[PDB]
Every structure is written in structure tokens, then in C-alpha cells.
């Protein structure tokens, strides 16, 4: 069992926090908010670093480049912006979607960015030029998540339309649609570190682990509350192997990857825990909450 325990609470955002992510080097934490803002924090001490301004409306997601130098964010302002982190410069503004941008991510090479929007589509952008390379007609409802795999060859996407689809990055061809038995709106999706599996959150208070090839649901993780918000989830693999995920009952849930039972429930937040993230190398988890709470928390573990 893990022993995660509160080490830091980070106040700053004046509106709901939407997403946190650890820089790839494990030095920084990045956060985005309904307050149109991004904030940087020291990954180990929670020491506030800087603030990054620019979006005209709130932000739903943010994501690090592979070298921890750039950031991309997805805003209700129908755009994405790319940022030099240490300079705080807005390098590019990606225009294209016809409604809110909801999720975003770099490919491992980080010459690419994938995004997802309420307009029901998925776009692939060029980092260097801000140009929309491809526009996949991905879903028939808003898009809740997008993620590259270990080598940038594949993108996974999810939607309120019930579906998780896998796409070939090069061609933009849909290689796979994942169908369960009931198909509740799909609110989050993410590859395993090795790309072999897929972890998917779904508004029936369920998380499922899928084998991407065979296209079959393997594990199921429940116990939490998730029926309204798109809550991030994670594979924790720095110590033991767990599944971490926010929850709408204000707690951070932890599951044993294999047996699929709750091995820990973190207490602290006072509103929906909307996002979680697991440090690159250390057993550190970052958590963040909605309008009524607005803080970010870091918990550490020995296991």
C-alpha cells in the first residue's frame, strides 16, 4: 500500500482550477484555471514561481513539452496558445476550432500538438508554425481528451459520444473504435506509459483499462463519484503501480493496478477534485479542485 500524505497546499487561482501536470523533468508543476490563468510551482516545495497571462476566457487544460521548456493550453476562447515557460512569451496562438478547446498534448517528439474541442473534432498542429496540419472528424459530441502514445505514432481520443477512438498520426485514419456494452459518455482517456494499454474514465462512476490491440476491457476500477465532470486519471509507476484519479466527492482515490481495489483515499479538498497528476520519478501526487476550493495539493509517499 502507498502512504500518500499532505505536504503542501497551493493557493493562487481565484476561480476553479482545471488541470495540473508535472513538467517532464520533475522540477515544476503547471496549473490552469477558469480564471484565464496559468501558474508555475516548484514540484517539491510548492513554492509559487510565476503567472502566465493571455487567454481571453478560461482554460480547461495545459500540457508540457518533452524538454519542459514549452507549454500548451486549451481555452474557452476557441484557441490554444504555446508558451515559452522561462520567458513567459506567447510563441503562437492556434486558431481553428469553432468552439471551446477542451484538451491538449504534445507528441513525444514535441514537433506536434493534438487538441480536442466542443466542436466535436480533433486537430493536429505544427509547433514551429502554429498551423493546423490535420482536422479529424473525430466524434459526434464534444471531445474530452486526446493523448499521443510512447512514440507519437498514435493518438487516442474520447468524447461525450460514448467513444474512444485511436488514430494514426501520420494519415489521420481512424484505426479503432472502442465499444463497451452501454457506452456512457467518455470523460477521460490516456495511454499507458508503454502504449500497450488505455485507461478510460466514464460518467457512470467507472474507470476501465483496455488492451488497445485486442480491443477488450481488462480491468475495472470503481468506488468514486464521477457523473458530471471530466476528471483526469493516471498510472502511478514510480513506486508500486496504482491508478490515481480525482473524484466528485472531494477525495483523491488510489487503486491497486492489478487487484483493482482502493488502496488509499486522500482527504483535504472541499470541492470536486477535478485533476490529478503523478510526478515523473518521485512518488508525488498533485491534486486540484473546483470553484469552492481552488487550491492545489501535493502528497508524498515512501511506497
Amino acid at each position: 500500500k502507498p502512504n500518500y500524505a499532505l505536504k503542501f497546499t497551493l493557493a493562487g487561482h481565484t476561480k476553479a482550477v482545471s488541470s495540473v501536470k508535472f513538467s517532464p523533468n520533475g522540477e515544476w508543476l503547471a496549473s490552469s484555471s477558469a480564471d484565464k490563468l496559468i501558474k508555475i510551482w516548484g514540484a517539491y516545495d510548492g513554492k509559487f514561481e510565476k503567472t502566465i497571462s493571455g487567454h481571453k476566457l478560461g482554460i480547461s487544460d495545459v500540457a508540457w513539452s518533452s524538454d519542459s521548456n514549452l507549454l500548451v493550453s486549451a481555452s474557452d476562447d476557441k484557441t490554444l496558445k504555446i508558451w515559452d515557460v522561462s520567458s513567459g512569451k506567447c510563441l503562437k496562438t492556434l486558431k481553428g476550432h469553432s468552439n471551446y478547446v477542451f484538451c491538449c498534448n504534445f507528441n513525444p517528439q514535441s514537433n506536434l500538438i493534438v487538441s480536442g474541442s466542443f466542436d466535436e473534432s480533433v486537430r493536429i498542429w505544427d509547433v514551429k508554425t502554429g498551423k493546423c496540419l490535420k482536422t479529424l472528424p473525430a466524434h459526434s459530441d464534444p471531445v474530452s481528451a486526446v493523448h499521443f502514445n510512447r512514440d507519437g505514432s498514435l493518438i487516442v481520443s474520447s468524447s461525450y459520444d460514448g467513444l474512444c477512438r485511436i488514430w494514426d498520426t501520420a494519415s489521420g485514419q481512424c484505426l479503432k473504435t472502442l465499444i463497451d456494452d452501454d457506452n456512457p459518455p467518455v470523460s477521460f482517456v490516456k495511454f499507458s506509459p508503454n502504449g500497450k494499454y488505455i485507461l478510460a474514465a466514464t460518467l457512470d462512476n467507472t474507470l476501465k483499462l483496455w488492451d488497445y490491440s485486442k480491443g477488450k476491457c481488462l480491468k475495472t476500477y470503481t468506488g468514486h463519484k464521477n457523473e458530471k465532470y471530466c476528471i483526469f486519471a493516471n498510472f502511478s509507476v514510480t513506486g508500486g503501480k496504482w491508478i490515481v484519479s480525482g473524484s466528485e466527492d472531494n477525495l483523491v482515490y488510489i487503486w491497486n493496478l492489478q487487484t483493482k481495489e482502493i488502496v488509499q483515499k486522500l482527504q483535504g479538498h472541499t470541492d470536486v477534485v477535478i485533476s490529478t497528476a503523478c510526478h515523473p520519478t518521485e512518488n508525488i501526487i498533485a491534486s486540484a479542485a473546483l470553484e469552492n476550493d481552488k487550491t492545489i495539493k501535493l502528497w508524498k509517499s515512501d511506497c
Binding site: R150, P193, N194, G195, K196, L218, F235, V237, K241
Partner: peptide, 10 residues
């Protein structure tokens, strides 16, 4: 049901 490696790339 049976172990599952999500870390190793083989």
C-alpha cells in the same frame, strides 16, 4: 485477472 505490465516496452 492475471498480471499486466504497463511499464515495459517489449
Amino acid at each position: 485477472d492475471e498480471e499486466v505490465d504497463v511499464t515495459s516496452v517489449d
